[PDB]
Design a binder for these strands. Structure first.
Ligand SMILES: [K+]
Ligand SMILES: [Mg+2]
Ligand SMILES: [Mg+2]
Ligand code: NA
Lengths: 240, 151, 156, 124
RNA sequence: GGGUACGACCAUACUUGGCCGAAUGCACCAUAUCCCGUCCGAUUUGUGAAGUUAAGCGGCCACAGGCCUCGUUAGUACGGCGAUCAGUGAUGGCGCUGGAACCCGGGGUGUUGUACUCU
RNA sequence: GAACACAAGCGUAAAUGCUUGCUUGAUUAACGAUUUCCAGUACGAAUCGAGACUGCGAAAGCAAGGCCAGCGAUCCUUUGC
RNA sequence: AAAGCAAAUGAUUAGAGGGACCUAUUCUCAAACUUUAAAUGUGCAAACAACCCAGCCUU
């Protein structure tokens, strides 16, 4: 048969980008995420990079540069046991916790704490955060820190843990533009978000029900510690 | 006299390269332009939007206007017995920063550095000198090389 | 050797190529539904030529056992492939034991079974896709040996 | 060239190769000079200075016949041509005297009508 | 001395085959009550470790193909300017000068930024 | 080495191709600027913008037709505000 | 221009190793073929209506 991969094939071959070969970067989306108005002469633009592995949740704030991307702040799921969560570390509740940590640490670094404290009581309702592009009729007050969500190659479905990290960052004080169309409680028929269903997922009621069912299957608490964890992060986010 | 459209002699002019096809990279996206800069106008041929006319490929000019996704450049063009200053609007992908003044700027930086050091050189081959060979060969046009030029 | 190199059945694909559209396809689609207890899909050239379905799991193993019983637990040597998969076909669904109703009629089908190890996810996952590897790939001889160990019987 | 070789020698004592192919197409106009672009009429070969047109390889005892055969064939060509004896060995890029030693050493890979010297670089 | 995440240049980084791999990891892997999507939890989505370094990943090797670089081809091919130059012509050399390419031979087979991290 | 309505060239692989879901940026756009032909006139075509109302997206973002060929003065008639 | 077909597209001669077919070669080519690629060319810059530094003002 005709043999492909001869000498002529290798001479004419053009290799793709290194990170495209490794299957790590979508350069079609990355080009739009870094693009900025030329009338803004190089003013900083930040990204919120969220990557979830088989055993970890990673949240980073990244500023793109020609020499190489620069990471301003990073939070990981394995630092949660220092705050009070020693199980899960991958579930939706851990996604919320790490989003709060990265938002709290970044505001602490900038000195912008004790302002833009976010919400104190946790609820699943929509926020409609304030940005320069679309503000809520107010221009006198100081604007919050802004970043745009970067989910990478993950498939963006309703009630995914990537959008869990987004909610935690918004509740922590960051201004990441978004819509509630992808939150767990959102129903597309009525275009309404069940804040009750959302609130349970943040506090891990779905995990508790499955654990209780599993205990029953073997035969023949979580909400309280999550609340304590949220308080601990909001108190001393720089501990390590 | 037939068929003089916007892109007439552009088969090889707007061709990309050998083993260098694709779309502009991040380094191109992050370039900053400001009014008064010198730029080169080269087409990319992978971006159809905002591509200049074939005359302005390879030309160098100065920028007069910055827009959210575009740059305005002033370029000279001789018409009959005069040169007209033309203005073209192109996208930022078909524009590169020009290095036509780095030698001049480096000269200015050296001059101030020389004055700064003075406040706080070369060997001429043209002039003669002694030469000691220690060996001398001869060129004689041997008959062997005459026989060599026979394919 | 390694406790992760065992050969397992990945999927079982059943295809019925009636070559027609209409009531014949409707009966065939129902017949496949009762056989595998799972909704089938129609394949077209447009013309709606054939129907087929893919079965993976325990029900794939049970269906494979029933088809092998019809085929008398014997297969030819050239029925296999260098990829590591084989297949066959039966001519009568009544011989499979299914009760006969004098409305559907009698149909045949083609069975294909794909074997592999537990590392095949790497070539199929969306992020960081790669190639399996020469050692981990299942060869024809390994496939024939696997068929000799369980459901014995082969003729060259 | 073929006819003389058969008559004055054996048909199994020589091999002739024509090294010029007729790839160029000529035109004929065949109203006056209105719409004068012409139709194809024939074919020809474009040659240049120093180009080899014919090649004969044979044995040493038939070279007087080889020269005479080429002289008669040269009479059919326009322009000026010369007949020379190659320094190489029979359609090969190898010198006549060096070929015997290299063939003895065995470092000459053999192809039909041409010879490639063995290269040290490669899989053993 | 390594790992992970985000990168810049985009083969000295690719392709085939072979050998090896402490730790933190990465990964394969287990399973469908809930969110979510399929003919099929194969892909995707949610839960979590009972195992496994077999594969993925990293390092090394191959007179291996490719790729990069320096020489050789070669002052060769071709060229700008000059002649009341040669030649029937086709063409060519000379004077002042610019100057290649393939084949082939020697060498090489990624460099590195930000953050968190195991000796 | 396929496809992208049609002639050809250029271009493109988690796409500029194919399938699918939702849509009407093929609307309006204060006489903004410019390129090609060029007399630096018009017409045709095209590029970069400011304002309104929107579409698709979680977002960054993309879109005021289908890239470049596919079209028309004075006078008169007719429609809209 | 040259060079190349032992590199993509097109044309094309003959042998060799496993009648077609395959592998590696081989003779000869291209205004509407090309990896490579001159000479002669063609934009821009090489300061005073400007530049460098210091201290300020306004939006
Ligand atoms: K607008
Ligand atoms: Mg996307
Ligand atoms: Mg048009
Ligand atoms: Na070009």
């Amino acid at each position: 048969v005709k043999v492909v991969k001869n000498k002529a094939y290798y001479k004419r071959f053009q290799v793709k980008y290194r990170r495209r070969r490794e299957g790590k970067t979508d350069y079609h989306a990355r080009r739009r995420m870094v693009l900025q108005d030329k009338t803004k002469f190089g003013t900083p633009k930040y990204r919120l990079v969220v990557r979830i592995t088989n055993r970890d949740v990673i949240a980073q704030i990244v500023h793109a540069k020609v020499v190489g991307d620069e990471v301003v702040m990073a939070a990981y799921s394995h630092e949660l046991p220092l705050f009070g969560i020693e199980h899960g570390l991958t579930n939706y509740a851990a996604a919320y916790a790490t989003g709060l940590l990265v938002a709290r640490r970044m505001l602490a670094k900038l000195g912008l704490a004790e302002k833009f404290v976010g919400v104190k009581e946790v609820d699943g309702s929509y926020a409609a955060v304030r940005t320069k592009d679309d503000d809520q009729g107010d221009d006198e007050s100081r604007f919050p820190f802004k970043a745009i969500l970067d989910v990478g190659l993950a498939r963006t479905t309703t009630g995914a843990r990537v959008f869990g990290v987004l909610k935690g960052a918004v509740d922590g004080g960051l201004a990441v533009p978004h819509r509630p169309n992808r939150f767990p409680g959102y129903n597309k028929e009525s275009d309404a978000l069940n804040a009750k269903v959302h609130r349970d997922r943040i506090f891990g009621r779905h995990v508790a029900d499955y654990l209780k069912q599993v205990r029953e299957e073997a035969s023949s608490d979580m909400e309280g510690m999550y609340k304590r964890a949220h308080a601990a992060i909001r108190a001393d986010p720089t501990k390590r | 006299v037939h068929s003089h459209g916007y892109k007439c002699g552009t088969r090889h002019l707007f061709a990309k390269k050998f083993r260098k096809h694709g779309v502009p990279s991040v380094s191109t996206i992050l370039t900053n332009f400001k009014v008064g800069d010198y730029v080169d106008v080269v087409a990319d041929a992978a971006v159809r939007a905002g591509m200049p006319h074939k005359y302005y490929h390879g030309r160098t000019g100065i920028v007069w206007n910055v827009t959210p996704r575009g740059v305005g450049v002033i370029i000279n063009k001789p018409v009959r017995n005069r040169t007209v200053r033309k203005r073209i609007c192109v996208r930022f992908e078909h524009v590169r920063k020009s290095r036509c003044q780095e030698a001049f700027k480096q000269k200015l930086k050296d001059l101030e550095a020389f004055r700064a050091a003075k406040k706080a050189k070369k060997v001429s081959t043209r002039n003669g000198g002694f030469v000691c060979p220690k060996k001398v060969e001869v060129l004689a046009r041997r008959t062997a090389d005459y026989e060599a030029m026979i394919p | 050797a390694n406790p992760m190199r065992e050969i397992v059945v990945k999927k079982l694909c059943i295809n019925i190529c009636v070559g027609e559209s209409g009531d014949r396809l409707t009966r065939a689609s129902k017949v496949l539904e009762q056989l595998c207890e799972q909704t089938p899909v129609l394949s077209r050239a447009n013309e709606k030529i054939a129907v087929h379905c893919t079965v993976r799991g325990k029900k794939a193993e049970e269906l494979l056992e029933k088809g092998l019983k019809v085929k008398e637990f014997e297969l030819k040597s050239y029925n296999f492939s260098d990829t590591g998969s084989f297949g066959f076909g039966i001519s009568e669904h009544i011989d499979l034991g299914i009760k006969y109703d004098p409305s559907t009629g009698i149909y045949g089908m083609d069975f294909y079974v794909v074997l592999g190890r537990r590392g095949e996810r790497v070539a199929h996952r969306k992020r960081r896709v790669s190639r399996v590897g020469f050692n981990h790939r299942v060869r024809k001889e390994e496939a024939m040996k696997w068929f000799e160990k369980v459901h014995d019987g082969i003729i060259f | 060239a073929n006819k003389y070789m058969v008559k004055r020698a054996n048909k199994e004592c020589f091999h002739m190769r024509i090294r010029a192919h007729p790839f160029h197409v000529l035109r004929i106009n065949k109203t006056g000079m209105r719409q004068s672009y012409g139709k194809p009429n024939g074919t020809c070969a474009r040659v240049r200075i120093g180009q080899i047109l014919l090649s004969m390889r044979t044995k040493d005892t038939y070279v007087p016949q080889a020269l005479e055969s080429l002289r008669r064939a040269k009479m059919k060509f326009p322009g000026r041509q010369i007949i020379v004896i190659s320094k190489y060995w029979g359609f090969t890029n190898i010198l006549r005297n060096e070929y015997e030693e290299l063939r003895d050493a065995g470092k000459l890979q053999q192809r039909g009508l041409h010879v490639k010297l063995i290269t040290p670089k490669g899989k053993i």
